[PDB]
Design a protein around this ligand. Sequence first.
Ligand SMILES: Cn1cnc2c(NCc3ccccc3)nc(NCCO)nc21
Length: 280
Amino acid sequence: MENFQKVEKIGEGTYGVVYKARNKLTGEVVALKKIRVPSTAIREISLLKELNHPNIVKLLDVIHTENKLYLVFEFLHQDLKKFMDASALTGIPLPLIKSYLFQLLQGLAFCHSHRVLHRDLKPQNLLINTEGAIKLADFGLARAFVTLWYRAPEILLGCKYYSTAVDIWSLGCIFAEMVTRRALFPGDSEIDQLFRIFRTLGTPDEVVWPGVTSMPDYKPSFPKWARQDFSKVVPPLDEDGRSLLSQMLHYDPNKRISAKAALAHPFFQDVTKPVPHLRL
Ligand SMILES: Cn1cnc2c(NCc3ccccc3)nc(NCCO)nc21
């Protein structure tokens, strides 16, 4: 819009291009998102404008002008993906990884309690500040209105009425990635994605996942793989970390751990809030 000096295109995703912009009037630097108009989209958004939390990127303003929608968000200095790319030679220390996951579970727990799902978590929409805080960006736009890597298996198998459990799956995937410095399931197609999950956690069945064989995209023709030990999957992570991850990656959406429950896991017993050395 004309109230902003679009100083840069910091990115672009499923819902449009995001720009680092300065408010011509307030002088503040904000993240301007040009959304790519449904009275309902508008109404879902208004709800999001009102959901505030320390671990959720704040939606400052909604500009519905000339039948166009722009979302104005607070600006954060870096995203997790870039930060991990910088740390790839030494990894993000466990204390920082632990603090980040803890904060992320709090954000998720706040949203999930309001029946708000993200549905598209990935390192790129996790933003961090020099203060050691991390926040979830784009929360709830999915309902208001492409890497398959963090996609929950029930979504891959055709489930249309998915739950908050899809976010815990995504988070578990990210958690593993920070630990090993390599993506857990780097799938290049929905079926490749699905068989990558199967080769590591083993092909699901009625025992571990009752109802699985009746899923829409489920085919009796799927290969049967065996489950690998987690010690081999996330070699560096301790027992507490592995049991937590295990619970986040349960096939059955109803058996997969909740964000609130995860906060009480013994893995977070020695959590602290260290500060990251960011290069801006
Ligand atoms: C809604 N929002 C608030 N701050 C940011 C931010 N800040 C990080 C940032 C700063 C400068 C250049 C690139 C990214 N990055 C992005 N998208 C980046 C994911 O590719 N959106 C943001």
